[PDB]
Amino acid sequence: MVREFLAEFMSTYVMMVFGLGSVAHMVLNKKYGSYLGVNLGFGFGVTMGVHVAGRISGAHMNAAVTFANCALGRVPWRKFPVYVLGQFLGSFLAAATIYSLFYTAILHFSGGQLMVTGPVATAGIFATYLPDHMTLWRGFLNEAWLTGMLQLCLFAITDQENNPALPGTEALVIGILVVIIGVSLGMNTGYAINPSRDLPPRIFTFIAGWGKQVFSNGENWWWVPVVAPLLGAYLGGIIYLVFIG
Amino acid sequence: MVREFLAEFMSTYVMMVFGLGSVAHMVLNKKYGSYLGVNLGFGFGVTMGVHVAGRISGAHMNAAVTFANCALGRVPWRKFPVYVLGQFLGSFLAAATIYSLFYTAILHFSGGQLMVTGPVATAGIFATYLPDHMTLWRGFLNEAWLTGMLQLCLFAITDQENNPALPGTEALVIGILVVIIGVSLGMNTGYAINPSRDLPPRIFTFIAGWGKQVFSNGENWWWVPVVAPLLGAYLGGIIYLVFIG
Amino acid sequence: MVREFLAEFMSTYVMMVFGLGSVAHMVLNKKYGSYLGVNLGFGFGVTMGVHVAGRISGAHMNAAVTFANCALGRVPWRKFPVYVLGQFLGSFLAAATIYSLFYTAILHFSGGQLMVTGPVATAGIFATYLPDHMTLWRGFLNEAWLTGMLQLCLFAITDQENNPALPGTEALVIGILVVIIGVSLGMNTGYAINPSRDLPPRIFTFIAGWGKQVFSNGENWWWVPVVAPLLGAYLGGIIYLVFIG
Amino acid sequence: MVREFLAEFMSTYVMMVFGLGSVAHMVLNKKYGSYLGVNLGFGFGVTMGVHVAGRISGAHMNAAVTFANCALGRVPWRKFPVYVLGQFLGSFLAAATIYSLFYTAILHFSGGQLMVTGPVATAGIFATYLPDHMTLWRGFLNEAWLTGMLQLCLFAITDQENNPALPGTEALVIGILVVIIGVSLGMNTGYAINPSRDLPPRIFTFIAGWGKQVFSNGENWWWVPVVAPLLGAYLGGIIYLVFIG
């Protein structure tokens, strides 16, 4: 149990550091940051996390992915709290890590103040916030479908009965999938397909002086990246089992 | 037969969702969309589809590719209607999926109206439309050569007698080929090398309120991405068999 | 001998079509072409060519690479004319292919005239031309070092005694090497590390109506991409054999 | 000992040539250079170096990585001076190589003068310099954490007891890790995670006429990329051994 917790903590921390840094690069600097880099930062950050903890715990790095495996009988329910606790600690510490490494850049870009919304907003480095045009229930649809897209492809990639990725190379294919999810479907909600990617960094920003507007922004958008991916991952998983399986 | 139909439906749906989303990103948003992302979205969307249905049906995901295999004796002719029906349903539902996920973005960008042509045109997200400078018969040449380029390389990648891609990794190499086809030869016609990629999304847009101009645009360009890839894929296939084989 | 000639012709044609198209995209269109796409177009165009002819002829696709192998005893000298003839025909026909597929785009961009130099120059799509600041003998240094960089890495990638790329995946690693050669060292001379990539497209443009300025441009620069890579590839090869071997 | 020295010299030279060229492209040219290309240039330059010397010496190509292996008992201490001497010579000669290949471009861009700081600064092509907003001790934190991130992931990728990358393909995964380190965390200090990447090119620029300001810039920043990565690599290594091991 301890080894599984440590594996999930380290794998989530590695992935979240790479993902949050790429978002920080895009938000803070123009000539060093791009949306493609954000997709590459999050996508291949998963690949490093898979190498870290793929054999010990499976490197879920995702509360929705862990929930789907537990709800589909692949992983015992008694390990679900341990996986989520490991991912939440790893993401929270990754957010603190990015804050320390980019503290001067965040202060220089924003100008001392930490604003959730505005032209110098820096809260979006850590958590995802709904755009102006999009609505909460459209964001729920986007979050669930994107997590279902990930879980269906995740099952196909690592299904030994089906056509799998070559063992020892599945980490790269998983990273490619995360890269193209952000590329193709990630502009509507910030593709927070991971509840561990969204809430722990949001809790950090509230503590780190960004204020309570992190939760109240977008008509209380904060809960959607926590609940919608769980439904989407479950739905994406059962569809694969019914159709392909 | 049912399993083969389901495999082609799911693999086409996964690939088309990734491909159409990347096109939607490029069309709707500047800071989140790029032509390279479109090539990455379509290219590695194929890779996910190959993992989904490569062992069950071969993951053709392409009516031209299916036609070439059937016309060259590799796949029975009786399965051609099943493969095409699966790909057409998967592409049509993928177009509806992209419409729902990007409905607010499409409405915000266009301004409520759905126009095939103009500065706020949104019909190009789903189907390919001929540019102003290019002609229909030049588009026929581009569509046939590009599909022949794909089919010749597809045969080489998955030819066990020749120098193949390593089994279990052929999905990545296939995705790379689709990425570089859009990069190098995809600006002239939108590289609709797949009849399933073009017609079903075009039928959806006509139903979804874009009007009958989807078919009448470009001097009735709609039929070229359906007929030209079939001739190109066949020609690309026989050339590989004669020369390399 | 015939099979080896056909393998070199087809592999060069596939690679050169992808490479020239990516250059055409960058030259003709801004929103669809980028220097990174040119590196991706040429780099992974090699990968497709390796899958085509890697087992039959080794897929040299490069007169300098063929010369180095022949001069280092790895390939018989009697096959050198056959490899070069195959690569020259494949590159010449690839240039004609790109001319037909981009004829309307080239005419629209240039405005009917075909100019070697100027703001609407289109001769650089096919052959490489020296920039204004660079000199001929500095270009000779760049061409030889870049080909030596390629040949040293090519030997390391496909050296079974050394640490090789995994068999069946060496095509991807070769393509990666070509991608990063253009990324890191390709802006000074256009990284025409292949004599087959430079001269046959230059001969085509002279025939295709661009005039005799294709050869006289840059103080008769045309011969440097033919002679310098041969010296560079040989020097890069012997260095690897002495040091690593 | 001689073979190990030659392997480290050649592998470092290959990687540093690709890395420095990509930085030169970004600094000197806008339409041919980008920050993503710099990450690709350094990242997959490591991959070529791994193929060169991975079996002979392990292809550390990094004084911090060599120090961590020696301090953790994986590599004898008597070989540490040989690895560092090989990497320092390979990086110094790579800097001279880039100077010769880009001499006309550097002269044209800067205008004859070689300035460490200013709008036409060219000293950043070879060595990393602290930005205006960042401080020396914040740079120390960035350099140590980034090297710890690399070493922890490097151990996971090449840990046969853990979940490894597939043998024969570990070079690509190592290159991917270096690519995403620059993408996500490389804008604060230039991600000089390698003491061999920083000091030898800095010594070259001082000799090559850039003056003594290369060492005095940023309140004597030159020593931080030499000392901080050693502490970071050691700390990143022991953490992996305690937690994952």
Side-chain angles (χ1 to χ4, degrees):
Chain A
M1 171 189 138
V2 151
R3 266 291 181 287
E4 217 143 5
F5 170 85
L6 286 174
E8 275 314 273
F9 163 79
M10 184 95 264
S11 74
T12 312
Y13 174 85
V14 166
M15 173 262 320
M16 279 300 306
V17 155
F18 285 123
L20 289 186
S22 68
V23 181
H25 272 75
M26 186 223 174
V27 170
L28 296 172
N29 213 232
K30 324 153 206 193
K31 69 188 246 213
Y32 287 152
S34 55
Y35 181 61
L36 180 54
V38 168
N39 312 319
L40 288 186
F42 262 112
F44 291 124
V46 179
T47 282
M48 295 320 141
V50 173
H51 283 293
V52 158
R55 292 243 31 138
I56 312 168
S57 73
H60 293 152
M61 286 133 81
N62 198 308
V65 164
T66 305
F67 173 84
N69 282 253
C70 291
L72 292 178
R74 290 161 164 248
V75 158
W77 262 118
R78 91 224 174 217
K79 298 178 174 181
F80 175 80
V82 194
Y83 277 72
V84 175
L85 181 53
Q87 294 152 20
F88 269 41
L89 289 187
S91 193
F92 184 81
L93 292 189
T97 295
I98 295 309
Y99 188 62
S100 304
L101 299 178
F102 292 80
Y103 184 88
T104 37
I106 292 160
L107 251 62
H108 179 98
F109 168 82
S110 58
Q113 306 193 2
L114 304 177
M115 303 282 341
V116 175
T117 171
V120 281
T122 35
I125 297 172
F126 306 84
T128 53
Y129 298 75
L130 213 52
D132 308 70
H133 68 269
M134 265 264 297
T135 73
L136 189 125
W137 291 114
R138 269 276 137 82
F140 195 103
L141 180 68
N142 271 256
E143 280 308 302
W145 216 276
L146 266 56
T147 322
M149 269 310 78
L150 158 84
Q151 185 63 96
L152 181 129
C153 292
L154 262 175
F155 272 169
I157 288 163
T158 55
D159 192 19
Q160 304 302 322
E161 277 69 52
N162 211 23
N163 188 29
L166 193 60
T169 88
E170 94 263 350
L172 208 80
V173 195
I174 292 168
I176 285 292
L177 163 70
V178 185
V179 165
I180 62 172
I181 284 178
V183 156
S184 53
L185 317 154
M187 114 225 189
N188 290 293
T189 64
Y191 73 109
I193 50 169
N194 184 358
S196 319
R197 179 258 176 271
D198 185 65
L199 184 52
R202 202 180 300 269
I203 298 177
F204 166 78
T205 49
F206 171 64
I207 293 177
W210 266 271
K212 54 166 59 39
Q213 279 146 109
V214 295
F215 296 116
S216 86
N217 192 266
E219 316 320 87
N220 285 74
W221 160 257
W222 70 269
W223 67 270
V224 176
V226 187
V227 181
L230 304 168
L231 166 67
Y234 184 75
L235 285 187
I238 166 63
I239 284 171
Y240 177 87
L241 288 186
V242 166
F243 283 163
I244 302 300
Chain B
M1 171 189 138
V2 151
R3 266 291 181 287
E4 217 143 5
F5 170 85
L6 286 174
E8 275 314 273
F9 163 79
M10 184 95 264
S11 74
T12 312
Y13 174 85
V14 166
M15 173 262 320
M16 279 300 306
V17 155
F18 285 123
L20 289 186
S22 68
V23 181
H25 272 75
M26 186 223 174
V27 170
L28 296 172
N29 213 232
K30 324 153 206 193
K31 69 188 246 213
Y32 287 152
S34 55
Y35 181 61
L36 180 54
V38 168
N39 312 319
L40 288 186
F42 262 112
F44 291 124
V46 179
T47 282
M48 295 320 141
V50 173
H51 283 293
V52 158
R55 292 243 31 138
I56 312 168
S57 73
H60 293 152
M61 286 133 81
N62 198 308
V65 164
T66 305
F67 173 84
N69 282 253
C70 291
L72 292 178
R74 290 161 164 248
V75 158
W77 262 118
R78 91 224 174 217
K79 298 178 174 181
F80 175 80
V82 194
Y83 277 72
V84 175
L85 181 53
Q87 294 152 20
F88 269 41
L89 289 187
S91 193
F92 184 81
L93 292 189
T97 295
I98 295 309
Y99 188 62
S100 304
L101 299 178
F102 292 80
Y103 184 88
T104 37
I106 292 160
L107 251 62
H108 179 98
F109 168 82
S110 58
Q113 306 193 2
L114 304 177
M115 303 282 341
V116 175
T117 171
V120 281
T122 35
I125 297 172
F126 306 84
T128 53
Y129 298 75
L130 213 52
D132 308 70
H133 68 269
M134 265 264 297
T135 73
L136 189 125
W137 291 114
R138 269 276 137 82
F140 195 103
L141 180 68
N142 271 256
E143 280 308 302
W145 216 276
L146 266 56
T147 322
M149 269 310 78
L150 158 84
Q151 185 63 96
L152 181 129
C153 292
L154 262 175
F155 272 169
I157 288 163
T158 55
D159 192 19
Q160 304 302 322
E161 277 69 52
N162 211 23
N163 188 29
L166 193 60
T169 88
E170 94 263 350
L172 208 80
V173 195
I174 292 168
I176 285 292
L177 163 70
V178 185
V179 165
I180 62 172
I181 284 178
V183 156
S184 53
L185 317 154
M187 114 225 189
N188 290 293
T189 64
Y191 73 109
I193 50 169
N194 184 358
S196 319
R197 179 258 176 271
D198 185 65
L199 184 52
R202 202 180 300 269
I203 298 177
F204 166 78
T205 49
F206 171 64
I207 293 177
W210 266 271
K212 54 166 59 39
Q213 279 146 109
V214 295
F215 296 116
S216 86
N217 192 266
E219 316 320 87
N220 285 74
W221 160 257
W222 70 269
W223 67 270
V224 176
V226 187
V227 181
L230 304 168
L231 166 67
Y234 184 75
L235 285 187
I238 166 63
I239 284 171
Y240 177 87
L241 288 186
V242 166
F243 283 163
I244 302 300
Chain C
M1 171 189 138
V2 151
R3 266 291 181 287
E4 217 143 5
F5 170 85
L6 286 174
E8 275 314 273
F9 163 79
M10 184 95 264
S11 74
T12 312
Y13 174 85
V14 166
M15 173 262 320
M16 279 300 306
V17 155
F18 285 123
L20 289 186
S22 68
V23 181
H25 272 75
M26 186 223 174
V27 170
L28 296 172
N29 213 232
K30 324 153 206 193
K31 69 188 246 213
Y32 287 152
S34 55
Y35 181 61
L36 180 54
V38 168
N39 312 319
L40 288 186
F42 262 112
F44 291 124
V46 179
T47 282
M48 295 320 141
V50 173
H51 283 293
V52 158
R55 292 243 31 138
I56 312 168
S57 73
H60 293 152
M61 286 133 81
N62 198 308
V65 164
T66 305
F67 173 84
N69 282 253
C70 291
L72 292 178
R74 290 161 164 248
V75 158
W77 262 118
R78 91 224 174 217
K79 298 178 174 181
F80 175 80
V82 194
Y83 277 72
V84 175
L85 181 53
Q87 294 152 20
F88 269 41
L89 289 187
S91 193
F92 184 81
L93 292 189
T97 295
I98 295 309
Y99 188 62
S100 304
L101 299 178
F102 292 80
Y103 184 88
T104 37
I106 292 160
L107 251 62
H108 179 98
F109 168 82
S110 58
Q113 306 193 2
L114 304 177
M115 303 282 341
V116 175
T117 171
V120 281
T122 35
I125 297 172
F126 306 84
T128 53
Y129 298 75
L130 213 52
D132 308 70
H133 68 269
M134 265 264 297
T135 73
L136 189 125
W137 291 114
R138 269 276 137 82
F140 195 103
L141 180 68
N142 271 256
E143 280 308 302
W145 216 276
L146 266 56
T147 322
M149 269 310 78
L150 158 84
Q151 185 63 96
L152 181 129
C153 292
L154 262 175
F155 272 169
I157 288 163
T158 55
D159 192 19
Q160 304 302 322
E161 277 69 52
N162 211 23
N163 188 29
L166 193 60
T169 88
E170 94 263 350
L172 208 80
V173 195
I174 292 168
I176 285 292
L177 163 70
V178 185
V179 165
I180 62 172
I181 284 178
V183 156
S184 53
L185 317 154
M187 114 225 189
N188 290 293
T189 64
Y191 73 109
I193 50 169
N194 184 358
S196 319
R197 179 258 176 271
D198 185 65
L199 184 52
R202 202 180 300 269
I203 298 177
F204 166 78
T205 49
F206 171 64
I207 293 177
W210 266 271
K212 54 166 59 39
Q213 279 146 109
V214 295
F215 296 116
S216 86
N217 192 266
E219 316 320 87
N220 285 74
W221 160 257
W222 70 269
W223 67 270
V224 176
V226 187
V227 181
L230 304 168
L231 166 67
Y234 184 75
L235 285 187
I238 166 63
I239 284 171
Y240 177 87
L241 288 186
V242 166
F243 283 163
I244 302 300
Chain D
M1 171 189 138
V2 151
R3 266 291 181 287
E4 217 143 5
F5 170 85
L6 286 174
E8 275 314 273
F9 163 79
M10 184 95 264
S11 74
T12 312
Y13 174 85
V14 166
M15 173 262 320
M16 279 300 306
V17 155
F18 285 123
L20 289 186
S22 68
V23 181
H25 272 75
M26 186 223 174
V27 170
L28 296 172
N29 213 232
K30 324 153 206 193
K31 69 188 246 213
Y32 287 152
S34 55
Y35 181 61
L36 180 54
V38 168
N39 312 319
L40 288 186
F42 262 112
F44 291 124
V46 179
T47 282
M48 295 320 141
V50 173
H51 283 293
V52 158
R55 292 243 31 138
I56 312 168
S57 73
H60 293 152
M61 286 133 81
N62 198 308
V65 164
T66 305
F67 173 84
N69 282 253
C70 291
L72 292 178
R74 290 161 164 248
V75 158
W77 262 118
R78 91 224 174 217
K79 298 178 174 181
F80 175 80
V82 194
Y83 277 72
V84 175
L85 181 53
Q87 294 152 20
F88 269 41
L89 289 187
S91 193
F92 184 81
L93 292 189
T97 295
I98 295 309
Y99 188 62
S100 304
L101 299 178
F102 292 80
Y103 184 88
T104 37
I106 292 160
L107 251 62
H108 179 98
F109 168 82
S110 58
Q113 306 193 2
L114 304 177
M115 303 282 341
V116 175
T117 171
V120 281
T122 35
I125 297 172
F126 306 84
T128 53
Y129 298 75
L130 213 52
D132 308 70
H133 68 269
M134 265 264 297
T135 73
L136 189 125
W137 291 114
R138 269 276 137 82
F140 195 103
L141 180 68
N142 271 256
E143 280 308 302
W145 216 276
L146 266 56
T147 322
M149 269 310 78
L150 158 84
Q151 185 63 96
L152 181 129
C153 292
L154 262 175
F155 272 169
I157 288 163
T158 55
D159 192 19
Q160 304 302 322
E161 277 69 52
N162 211 23
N163 188 29
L166 193 60
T169 88
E170 94 263 350
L172 208 80
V173 195
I174 292 168
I176 285 292
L177 163 70
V178 185
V179 165
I180 62 172
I181 284 178
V183 156
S184 53
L185 317 154
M187 114 225 189
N188 290 293
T189 64
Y191 73 109
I193 50 169
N194 184 358
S196 319
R197 179 258 176 271
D198 185 65
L199 184 52
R202 202 180 300 269
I203 298 177
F204 166 78
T205 49
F206 171 64
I207 293 177
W210 266 271
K212 54 166 59 39
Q213 279 146 109
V214 295
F215 296 116
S216 86
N217 192 266
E219 316 320 87
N220 285 74
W221 160 257
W222 70 269
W223 67 270
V224 176
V226 187
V227 181
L230 304 168
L231 166 67
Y234 184 75
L235 285 187
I238 166 63
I239 284 171
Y240 177 87
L241 288 186
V242 166
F243 283 163
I244 302 300

